[PDB]
Amino acid sequence: HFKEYQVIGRRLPTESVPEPKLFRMRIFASNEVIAKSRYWYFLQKLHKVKKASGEIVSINQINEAHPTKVKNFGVWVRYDSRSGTHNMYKEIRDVSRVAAVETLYQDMAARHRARFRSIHILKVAEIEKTADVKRQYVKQFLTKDLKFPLPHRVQKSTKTFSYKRPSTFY
Amino acid sequence: RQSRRTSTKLKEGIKKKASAHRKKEKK
Amino acid sequence: VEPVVVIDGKGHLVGRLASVVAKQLLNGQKIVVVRAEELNISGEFFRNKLKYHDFLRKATAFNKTRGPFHFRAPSRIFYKALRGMVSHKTARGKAALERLKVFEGIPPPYDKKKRVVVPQALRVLRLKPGRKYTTLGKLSTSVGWKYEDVVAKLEAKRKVSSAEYYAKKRAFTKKVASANATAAESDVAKQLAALGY
Amino acid sequence: RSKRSKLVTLAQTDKKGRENKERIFDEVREALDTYRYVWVLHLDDVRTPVLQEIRTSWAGSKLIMGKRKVLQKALGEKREEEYKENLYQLSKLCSGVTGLLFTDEDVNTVKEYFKSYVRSDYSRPNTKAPLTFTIPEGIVYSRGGQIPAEEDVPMIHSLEPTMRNKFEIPTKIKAGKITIDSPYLVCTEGEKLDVRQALILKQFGIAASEFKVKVSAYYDNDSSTVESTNIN
Amino acid sequence: DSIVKASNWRLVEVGRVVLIKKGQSAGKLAAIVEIIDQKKVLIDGPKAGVPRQAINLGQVVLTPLTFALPRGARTATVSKKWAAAAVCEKWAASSWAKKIAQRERRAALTDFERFQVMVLRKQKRYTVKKALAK
Amino acid sequence: MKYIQTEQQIEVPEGVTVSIKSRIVKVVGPRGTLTKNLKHIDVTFTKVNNQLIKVAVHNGGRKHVAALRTVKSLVDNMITGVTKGYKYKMRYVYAHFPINVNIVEKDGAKFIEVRNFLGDKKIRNVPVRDGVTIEFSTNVKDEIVLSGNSVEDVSQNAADLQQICRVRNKDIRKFLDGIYVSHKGFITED
RNA sequence: GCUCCACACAGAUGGAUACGAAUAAGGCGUCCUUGUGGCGUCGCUGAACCAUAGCAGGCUAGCAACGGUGCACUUGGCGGAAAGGCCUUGGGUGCUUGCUGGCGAAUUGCAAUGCGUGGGGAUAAAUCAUUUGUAUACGACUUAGA
RNA sequence: GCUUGUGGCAGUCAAGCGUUCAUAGCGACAUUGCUCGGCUCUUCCUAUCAUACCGAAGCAGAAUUCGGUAAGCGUUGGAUUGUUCACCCACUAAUAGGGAACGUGAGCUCCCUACUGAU
RNA sequence: AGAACUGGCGAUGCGGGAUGAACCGAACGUAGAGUUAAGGUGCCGGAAUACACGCUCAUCAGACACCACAAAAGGUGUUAGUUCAUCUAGACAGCCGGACGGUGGCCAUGGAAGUCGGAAUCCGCUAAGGAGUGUGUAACAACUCACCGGCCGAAUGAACUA
RNA sequence: GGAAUACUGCCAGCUGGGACUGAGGACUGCGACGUAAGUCAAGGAUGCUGGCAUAAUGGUUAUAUGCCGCCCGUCUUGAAA
Description:
This is part of a larger assembly, with chains A, B, C, D, E and F. The N and C termini of chain D lie far apart (54 Å). Chain D is α+β, with helices and mostly antiparallel strands. Chain D has helices spanning 18-34, 48-57, 68-75, 88-93, 107-116, 160-165, 195-203, and strands spanning 37-42, 62-64, 100-103, 118-121, 172-174, 177-179, 209-212, 214-220, 226-228. By secondary structure, chain E is α+β, with helices and mostly antiparallel strands. Chain E has a domain at 11-93: SH3 type barrels (Roll). Chain E is built from 4 helices and 7 strands; from the N terminus they run βββββββαααα. Chain E has a 5-stranded antiparallel β-sheet with strand order 6-5-4-3-7. Chain F is built from 2 helices and 14 strands. Chains in contact: A-C, A-E, A-F, C-E, D-F, E-F. At the A-E interface, β7 of A face β2 and β6 of E. β7 (148-149) of chain A pairs antiparallel with β2 (11-12) of chain E. The structure holds 4 RNA strands. Chain B: Belongs to the TRAFAC class YlqF/YawG GTPase family. Chain B: It is found in: Nucleus. Chain B: GTPase required for 60S ribosomal subunit export to the cytoplasm. Chain B: This is Nuclear GTP-binding protein NUG1.
């Protein structure tokens, strides 16, 4: 499970160079420390630095603005594989920034075998207006009055011996 | 029909093929 | 619980069914499986029909007769299946498949007595709706079992002679569900309800 | 996966697309001011040597074709969407075939010409034909039993497979000659034709269908008047 | 005369009332506010006290009850319409909710109160077996 | 792509009336009746106005979505088969030996004889499926007509009439003998 | 086996509580236009159902029902898949916690669950021995004999 | 996880990968140049020689060639042996290739048990 | 293959890897109780026929183990992406219509008209028509798609990546 | 604008259920509670009650079941052989 972490770092202020540039990035991780560890890894890919050369200025959690609303999430993702790395974009209809990146990570495992070490999340953004939605399986729920059933319902039994012979209507 | 047991001479004669692929890449 | 749990294959998955039928003997549980032939499985037909013959070939060299005997009749097909997860060979084992019994059809004295099923193992309820799934019957036959019919026929009989039964019962109840209904709503009753009953 | 892979083509012609639609869009708008009178033609079905004959009749006046929806939008669709005054009224009336004509000549010289102009053409789908065509019960000929047999050549054995499938007629072949057992009749006078009924009469080379080109709406540029006339 | 038989279902729709099995909420009625995807709906039932949340449809069961609700409706707005349809009265009227009560009410019998039940069921039988064989 | 709700439409004309319980489909009309089991396919029929039927398929895979369109067709062909009927005309040809096709009422089962074909003493007896009727083409030399309700009965029996007349170990081009389906059509042409 | 003597003594603890078929469907109830028919209703676990109070379940007094139930009998019917059981009729005899009674419980001391033998007698048969050869290494097999 | 079918050498090739990316340079299928063994009796394999059914061929018929499924059933006899390390006409539907290691060299120039049967 | 270094076994049991010199854990007095490692929890087997998201149908799937060898590709299996292009100025598919004029271009020749060939592949008309993509003919015809257009009313196609 | 509530963390917060253990043997010590007298959960279990002598109980051997267990010694070689 995930949380979002606002992190800033500044390569310890040397002589004649007071207060450098400050690099802000939103990291999805499971805890504050994974977050920090990830932060430097991204720093080494943007430019030439190291974990000892800099300092974590401020690492603060971000909660989701309205987690009783359903948004749609257009996500940019860089990820490595068996081949050389390559950019991507998917869409996710979801509740929260965080549950979105979460459900993306499952999909990134399921389809492309890539694990959390490989994936950089580039940018996650809400899409406000429809028609900016470029994927079919998302557009699929953006129809007026979507009434459907869930046929063939498995009723999970605790007891091994059932006398009724189970029927699956809903 | 073929089998799906790995005989140990193979199961460890894979490691000793994989080790040869390690020293090959470096040079 | 119940001393004898006459099961019933009719829409189960040879595996699974088994397993559990298994554990249950191991934990001292007199079972009894019926309608073996209406047992099912997974996959096309023209498969089980393989994942078998192969099995068939097997058999012994120097002396074919002494070796992996290929039973045809359903029952047994499914037996095996099961005598295959029970350290059979060891007192505790033998002591099991001792506790077992697998008829094709559903002959007396079981005809007359409630059966049951084993969720955790029905085609309907496990196989992603609409997927290839074999049904012993054929699968036996296809490879020896000489009776599919007898069973069949000398079946239809049962079903009959029963349903008939049924009725007589459905008729009966109705009366009750009626008496109780009427002589329901008078005090006494009421009260109960309060407690719940 | 699994899709209809299109027939691989190595043709010397390229797809026109939008580079042609823009060239037509400007050509209609440049011809509206230069000329004075405009016509819109409902030319139902048109042979190419017939179209070039209308072209070579006069080089002064311009003929305009293309897409119907190109011809709606270059001119005007509504009272807001317009290049000229009351220009949308003529575009709403033309709905069939696209045909249009710009002219600088007299009104009476045009309409008298097009009423008199009627040409020989093949029988067309969904349109009636005034003939009762009967085929002889022996060897069939290129005309199909209208002219004497001595003048005409017997039909090619190569085309008979098509005669059985699309043209339907029960055809057997003896010594390289197409033969039917009974005197076949395809069509009658005063009956609406189907596609196969049309193509039979197209194969035999029968010109038993009158082609008269009709015109509908009329417009003058400086006066901005819309005139409606139903000619045939 | 054309008869296409059966095909009846409960449907995931904006404003279907649901009963949740697994969870902290459990046995408490909420209603679907917005379908997220195939498996997730967004629920809430402020009358019971269960909060507004993403939820797998495996946690929950749909009911033979529904009402008029706008898409993405808020807690106050849900409550209004819930009170407008007055579902609880409709809900507890069903043999479905009556069973859930009948499970619960029996579960909290005293040993003595359970004895009474036996004693009554002794009487209620005598009157019943009287009525039959006539 | 995992669709959500995939439905077709089945247009029902005024003559026929459809009955569908489970996935069994009756088409009762002018020419008679047709029944078909469709349990093997697993879809959802929906009567909408006594005049349109919607088969839907929820949460379908491409292979399950496919299964839907073929159900529209296989009910369409059950409807067209009663209002209009299906008639298949077969003409048979030869080089030297004229084929002497007849129909026998042996054991009341109705078979079609194929005699003398390419000089055969082997008489090829072909069953006739119930529902489908046979009649010889009048005023047309050497032609036979297969007319029935169902598309199966007809076209399958046409196929059994054709496949019996291969030429064993000979040339395709040189030998013309056999029975071929000339024309596919309707009983009532309109 | 019958008869006479002599002796010997793989886990029960309220109830295995009978439709079939489907599961993109089904029960159950009702009206009949007898159907792939309509209307009603159920399911979302057996957490049910039926039994269930009495010295480990006694001894006696009535009331109200005309039922419930146990037991040997008796009439008729069903069950051949491994029927080896399942129903019913008639009477007798118990019991009835359906309702109300009238007596006893202790000291058990504060837990330690509380149908074979060895001889006889009578009679069915097999074997051995003999005989035959269709059988045969030896067996075994086939024959025949109050 | 050994092995089986199309040589190596120089090159018009030409998708991409090469620190930058055709000119660090490789580069797939193609095409240009030279050129001391062999007689019985069992079993299995298919990569099939016949027989079985098909598919293709300017295949008219008869016969042929190529290919497919198939191992059900079949697969010969004579002159050569200074080290057998060659082959030819005679028939037949056809006279296929192999494995089972020192296969049957304890058939060749009073250790244990499989098996056939018997009580 | 050879050289150097550091371990493991050698003097070493114990849990795990179905079984094992080289792997995983863990270096041992005798016990009780607790917690774990490595490995597992359908049944054989102690332990979730657990929950959650997806993916996969295999005519002997897969659970094959520095993802290493047979591996560069093939497939109208399937799910997702990336990059080019059309898209209510009506796309994709589809029956329908046009698909022309110097011209039956020119050498080759009994016969070549787009279509047995050789070298150019022009020009005019238009909405668009290739001195022509095939069927066919002795040669023509007729058919053909490619390019338009009409009837229909929305998303579709191509190259690839995983 | 106003509360909450989850989440993280704290308590020298309170109240339960279960198993295993009871080493040691006068008193000294560190404490706590009490105004004191004293008392205590403070340098390791005490209290009450029940079962028996035709005992209670404990053992031996023969098997049964579950699980585990390559044939001892010597001698090589890197161990298995």
